[PDB]
Amino acid sequence: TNTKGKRRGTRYMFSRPFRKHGVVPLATYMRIYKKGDIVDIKGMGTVQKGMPHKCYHGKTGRVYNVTQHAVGIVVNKQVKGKILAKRINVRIEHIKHSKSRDSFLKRVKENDQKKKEAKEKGTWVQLKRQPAPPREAHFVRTNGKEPELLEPIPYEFMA
Amino acid sequence: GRRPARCYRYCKNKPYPKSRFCRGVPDAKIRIFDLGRKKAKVDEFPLCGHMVSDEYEQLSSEALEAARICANKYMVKSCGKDGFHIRVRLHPFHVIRINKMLQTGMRGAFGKPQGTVARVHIGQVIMSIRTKLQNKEHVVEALRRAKFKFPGRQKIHISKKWGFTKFNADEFEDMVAEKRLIPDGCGVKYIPNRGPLDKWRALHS
Amino acid sequence: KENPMRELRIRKLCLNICVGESGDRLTRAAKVLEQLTGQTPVFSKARYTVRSFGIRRNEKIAVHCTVRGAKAEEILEKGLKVREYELRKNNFSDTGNFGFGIQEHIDLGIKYDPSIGIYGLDFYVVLGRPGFSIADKKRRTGCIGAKHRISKEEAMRWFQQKYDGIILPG
Amino acid sequence: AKSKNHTTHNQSRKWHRNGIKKPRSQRYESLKGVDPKFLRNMRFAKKH
Amino acid sequence: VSPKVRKVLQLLRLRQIFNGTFVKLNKASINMLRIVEPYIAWGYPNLKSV
Amino acid sequence: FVKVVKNKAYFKRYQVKFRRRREGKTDYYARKRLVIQDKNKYNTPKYRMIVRVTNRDIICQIAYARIEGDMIVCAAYAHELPKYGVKVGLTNYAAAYCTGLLLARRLLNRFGMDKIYEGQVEVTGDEYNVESIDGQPGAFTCYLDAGLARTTTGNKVFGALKGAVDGGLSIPHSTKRFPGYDSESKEFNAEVHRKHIMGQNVADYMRYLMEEDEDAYKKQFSQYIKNNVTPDMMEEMYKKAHAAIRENPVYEKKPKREVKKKRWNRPKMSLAQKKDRVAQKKASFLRAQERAA
RNA sequence: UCAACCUAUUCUCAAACUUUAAAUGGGUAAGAAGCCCGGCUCGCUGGUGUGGAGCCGGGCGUGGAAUGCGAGUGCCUAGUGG
RNA sequence: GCUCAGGGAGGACAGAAACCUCCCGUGGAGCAGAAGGGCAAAAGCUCGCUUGAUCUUGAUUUUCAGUACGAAUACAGACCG
RNA sequence: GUCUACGGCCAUACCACCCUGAACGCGCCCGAUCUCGUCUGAUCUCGGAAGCUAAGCAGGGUCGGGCCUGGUUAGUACUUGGAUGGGAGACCGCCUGGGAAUACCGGGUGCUGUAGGCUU
Numbered sequence A: 001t002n003t004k005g006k007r008r009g010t011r012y013m014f015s016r017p018f019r020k021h022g023v024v025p026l027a028t029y030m031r032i033y034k035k036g037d038i039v040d041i042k043g044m045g046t047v048q049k050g051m052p053h054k055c056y057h058g059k060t061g062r063v064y065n066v067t068q069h070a071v072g073i074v075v076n077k078q079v080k081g082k083i084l085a086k087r088i089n090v091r092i093e094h095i096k097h098s099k100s101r102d103s104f105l106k107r108v109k110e111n112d113q114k115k116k117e118a119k120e121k122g123t124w125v126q127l128k129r130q131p132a133p134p135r136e137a138h139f140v141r142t143n144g145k146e147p148e149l150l151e152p153i154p155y156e157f158m159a
Numbered sequence B: 001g002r003r004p005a006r007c008y009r010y011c012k013n014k015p016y017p018k019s020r021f022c023r024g025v026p027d028a029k030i031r032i033f034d035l036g037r038k039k040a041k042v043d044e045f046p047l048c049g050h051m052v053s054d055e056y057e058q059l060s061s062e063a064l065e066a067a068r069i070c071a072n073k074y075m076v077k078s079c080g081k082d083g084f085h086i087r088v089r090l091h092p093f094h095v096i097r098i099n100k101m102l103q104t105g106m107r108g109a110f111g112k113p114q115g116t117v118a119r120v121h122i123g124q125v126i127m128s129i130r131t132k133l134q135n136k137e138h139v140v141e142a143l144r145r146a147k148f149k150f151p152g153r154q155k156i157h158i159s160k161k162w163g164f165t166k167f168n169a170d171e172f173e174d175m176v177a178e179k180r181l182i183p184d185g186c187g188v189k190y191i192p193n194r195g196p197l198d199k200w201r202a203l204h205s
Numbered sequence C: 001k002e003n004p005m006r007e008l009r010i011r012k013l014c015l016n017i018c019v020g021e022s023g024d025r026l027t028r029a030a031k032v033l034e035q036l037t038g039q040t041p042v043f044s045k046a047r048y049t050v051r052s053f054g055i056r057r058n059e060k061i062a063v064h065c066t067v068r069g070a071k072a073e074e075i076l077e078k079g080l081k082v083r084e085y086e087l088r089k090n091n092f093s094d095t096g097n098f099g100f101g102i103q104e105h106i107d108l109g110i111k112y113d114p115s116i117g118i119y120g121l122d123f124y125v126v127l128g129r130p131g132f133s134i135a136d137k138k139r140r141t142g143c144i145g146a147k148h149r150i151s152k153e154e155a156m157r158w159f160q161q162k163y164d165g166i167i168l169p170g
Numbered sequence D: 001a002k003s004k005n006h007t008t009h010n011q012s013r014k015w016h017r018n019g020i021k022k023p024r025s026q027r028y029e030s031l032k033g034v035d036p037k038f039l040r041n042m043r044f045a046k047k048h
Numbered sequence E: 001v002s003p004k005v006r007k008v009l010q011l012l013r014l015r016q017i018f019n020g021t022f023v024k025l026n027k028a029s030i031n032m033l034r035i036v037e038p039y040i041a042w043g044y045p046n047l048k049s050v
Numbered sequence F: 001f002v003k004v005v006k007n008k009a010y011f012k013r014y015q016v017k018f019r020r021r022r023e024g025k026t027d028y029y030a031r032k033r034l035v036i037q038d039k040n041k042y043n044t045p046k047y048r049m050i051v052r053v054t055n056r057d058i059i060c061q062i063a064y065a066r067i068e069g070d071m072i073v074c075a076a077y078a079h080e081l082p083k084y085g086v087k088v089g090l091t092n093y094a095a096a097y098c099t100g101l102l103l104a105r106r107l108l109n110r111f112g113m114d115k116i117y118e119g120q121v122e123v124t125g126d127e128y129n130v131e132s133i134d135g136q137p138g139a140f141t142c143y144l145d146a147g148l149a150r151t152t153t154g155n156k157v158f159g160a161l162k163g164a165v166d167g168g169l170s171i172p173h174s175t176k177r178f179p180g181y182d183s184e185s186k187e188f189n190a191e192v193h194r195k196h197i198m199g200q201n202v203a204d205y206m207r208y209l210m211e212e213d214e215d216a217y218k219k220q221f222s223q224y225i226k227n228n229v230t231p232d233m234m235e236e237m238y239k240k241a242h243a244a245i246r247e248n249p250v251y252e253k254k255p256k257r258e259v260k261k262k263r264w265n266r267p268k269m270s271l272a273q274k275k276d277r278v279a280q281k282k283a284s285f286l287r288a289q290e291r292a293a
Numbered sequence G: 001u002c003a004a005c006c007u008a009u010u011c012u013c014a015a016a017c018u019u020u021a022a023a024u025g026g027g028u029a030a031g032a033a034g035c036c037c038g039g040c041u042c043g044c045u046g047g048u049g050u051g052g053a054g055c056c057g058g059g060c061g062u063g064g065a066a067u068g069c070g071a072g073u074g075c076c077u078a079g080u081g082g
Numbered sequence H: 001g002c003u004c005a006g007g008g009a010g011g012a013c014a015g016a017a018a019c020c021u022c023c024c025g026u027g028g029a030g031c032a033g034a035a036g037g038g039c040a041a042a043a044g045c046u047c048g049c050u051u052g053a054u055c056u057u058g059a060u061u062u063u064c065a066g067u068a069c070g071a072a073u074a075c076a077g078a079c080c081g
Numbered sequence I: 001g002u003c004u005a006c007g008g009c010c011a012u013a014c015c016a017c018c019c020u021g022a023a024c025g026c027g028c029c030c031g032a033u034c035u036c037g038u039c040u041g042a043u044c045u046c047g048g049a050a051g052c053u054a055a056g057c058a059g060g061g062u063c064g065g066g067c068c069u070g071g072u073u074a075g076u077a078c079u080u081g082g083a084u085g086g087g088a089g090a091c092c093g094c095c096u097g098g099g100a101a102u103a104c105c106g107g108g109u110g111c112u113g114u115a116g117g118c119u120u
């Protein structure tokens, strides 16, 4: 059986990247988190206070509490057959905002501005994102030259 | 009392080297790897012939040295004493294990280190010969006699490289004449156009 | 004419006496070079324990000082007037630093006391130049560049133009 | 009398037979665990 | 059936053997068909086929 | 020989410090413990009073940290003290107090809390710290930032601290480091601190040298002699400085000049020029060798 | 000369080595519980009707990827654990 | 407040190795231990002052049945360094 | 064009050597009475301005090492899925998709926020 330590098997997980050791940069401290900000977890070995458990490295949750040095977030952990939306308390530097919510917020304010525009004009814009359609019909100009002939080059055992 | 090589012939386990963890490995049998007139510059052996392999198998250290001796004997009777350069391009690092019986059985089953093998990919060179341009059939016959000391099926290929160098034989003399290659014994050193040009003027003076 | 901020000036003269024992021998050697310099010394402890020397770890076995400025120049001129203003060539470090070692401190002009005895001294003078405070100050620590360092030959020609000394090779 | 020791074989089909049900999504989840000084402040702000 | 393929077949509404369904093509749908693709034969039908 | 320490492997696995830590100007340990707002405070600024004492003037700024940089709100330098009446001597404890006071009164006039929060109108030297009064808007609190001065007793950093404290900034501090706190008996007399604030150590040393020997006096204090500051000038000169600072604190900017755009540095050599110069080096070396042969 | 050394080169490796570093895969999101305004409360935070949070009040529906399908929830419970 | 292992060059007895100095020195040292992570104006070494190794209710993580004990993480109320 | 004070991202900024720096600065520098601290005013602290770009630092150079970023290596190695494919095996080929890394060869060598100077 394996051991059941809190940090077992995290040799390459909580270690810093190559040539990014040293002092933590201070933007990661100066960022501010409201409640309901969608937040990634990425644990870090330069600090040990407030470590997210190795079940949560990479997982993304939602902030339900912000404190003086740490936030409390609500992440989904899957254990054997169920999913638990559970509360953890993570210090501020194991954490980034998720841009997955920010791209949606950009698209919402863009859809709302071009809904409040082109309602007075009368035209009907498209707001859903249809997926990448098949390529429509198009001519290919072979301007001048014949296409280049290819053939498989014969086997030479170069080893 | 060594087990026959058909036991430890396939690349079965994770590569398991003689290290801090597997200590007490008995000494590998092959230890001389390069011989012949190995103190000879690359201007005077143009031909290179490789015993290349064709099976993803494990060659043993004893088979490597038996093949070394079988090539060496034939080339010292054929191409004089010091008119060649043999080098075995495999060094055995994988150590293999032996669970010996004599009554426990299989409880506590993990082998003592027995011997040392080399794991060989498809197209990985086993032995390689550096000779002159008219001792080509002697190279072919030497590696053909050395195939029968190895398990599995090996091929023989005369290469387009100038000896034991990574540069092509039709371009070697042109490059060394225009001073991009500098002889230093068994090999040759390449000269880029990236250095400080004090080395450039030192070459061209 | 040369730029007056490249003057070869001594930065410190550090002296020591390694007695190899503790107690009375060491404390009277401390009294020796306090009597020499005019400032109290510091006892240098031993890092290791090596029983072929008879010293053990953290045992006080040396006495040293560092003197500056004018007092350094007077002590240095007394050491060169005991060795006749004549030094070997190997006495010069690659960084231009030099130094030597004298046999008994009576020769400097220190009056003898039988409660004191005699001790050999080791003089070591590190030179400088205006600007070597850069590598030692706190707030913006930098190095000192290549044109401003002290080479071995430009230090020994300083020696034999400022003390008019004789260096002998070997 | 040895036996098989650990297995997670039929566990996947056992889980997805009733389905991996994602957690209960509700507006207005609770407030226990929130910073109690902030929760004092919130209760006075509701009280007045 | 591998369970990923069973789920994509349940979304394509091919349950029994030798059923058929029209499917319009886009980037989501071609990847959905290609996860299934040892289990289906899918083509570009004529107007007579429709 | 010796094995080369600074080889390819050394330079490729070498990790730098930060830029400001390479130049040594900032201490990131103290900077992180000093500027980082509590995360429940939620974008509320955390103000600092930076004191940096140079060789020839004293820079006192206030600063709160954002992600883009450090926003400075107010700035006060020692080299604008001739506007207020300190002619020269810009890097002593007295000018440190004056620029701390100037920083405080200039910031409070920028925020419009100048009639409120006078602080010590007259300076005493003992402990003070301004209390925020009720109904009127609260006092400005900023925390002191000394950087890399070894914060021992009598530091001009703490001179500028007492300047901002008597100006009306509510900087938390204790009177252990002001000049006057004797380390043996552990008290803090105010009149010795007041002598250091009014520069009476300098005036007493001025009278000391002009009694002892005049040559070292003229070598030591020379711009005082050019600007005719006798030791009897000193205390009322700093009092007039404190009065002028407290009754006209706002800063006048110098107007922008039409710059003629002359290039003082050699611009970056281009690729065509550098491969052309190495072509010329190779051609010139070959022709010099073949005409020497 | 033969050595260690040192400097560029070269042959072969690593489950418990690594600068690089895939495929498969793991979370989150793809709106009405969302946006945008107007305003009150707080003993928390506070240069600052500051910051945050909570409460009212109003206006916004193109239901904001594809595809498929009616869903959520509560008892009691056998058998199983070679 | 200082920089470590190691190496180079000097220096009375002194040496392969005691001590003093200069220079290079991205951690090649140290942090009690087994190893892995982590760390350079520190988490290392040396000082100064000390008892937050204290009183107290909750929440959460960790193995988990999502139960205990242990260990740990943000807080909160004092009393302090 | 440029610098100081505080910085952000932390080498496109580092490291070795060389050249050039007008004005303001930043420095080196001159001192130790007082504050302070040492074996030593070297450091730290404190009081200054006789001198100097010599160093720091700033800008620039090197067929520079490094780093960053492209090409090549290569649709190679590897790889999700498939066959009643091959082979005695080892392993290999094919279909459906995804797709790296050295060596080698080019390009780049700090951007920039807030406050305040200089270039009368």
Ligand SMILES: [Mg+2]
Pocket: B012, B013
């Ligand atoms: Mg096996």
Ligand SMILES: [Mg+2]
Pocket: none
């Ligand atoms: Mg069985």
Ligand SMILES: [Mg+2]
Pocket: D003, D004
């Ligand atoms: Mg069982």
Ligand SMILES: [Mg+2]
Pocket: F027, F030
């Ligand atoms: Mg500090």
Ligand SMILES: [Mg+2]
Pocket: G078
């Ligand atoms: Mg039953």
Ligand SMILES: [Mg+2]
Pocket: none
């Ligand atoms: Mg510390």
Ligand SMILES: [Mg+2]
Pocket: I041
């Ligand atoms: Mg001095």
Ligand SMILES: [Mg+2]
Pocket: I053, I055
């Ligand atoms: Mg200079």
Ligand SMILES: [Mg+2]
Pocket: none
């Ligand atoms: Mg210069």
Ligand SMILES: [Mg+2]
Pocket: I064
């Ligand atoms: Mg380069």
Ligand SMILES: [Mg+2]
Pocket: none
């Ligand atoms: Mg700038």
Ligand SMILES: [Mg+2]
Pocket: none
């Ligand atoms: Mg003009």
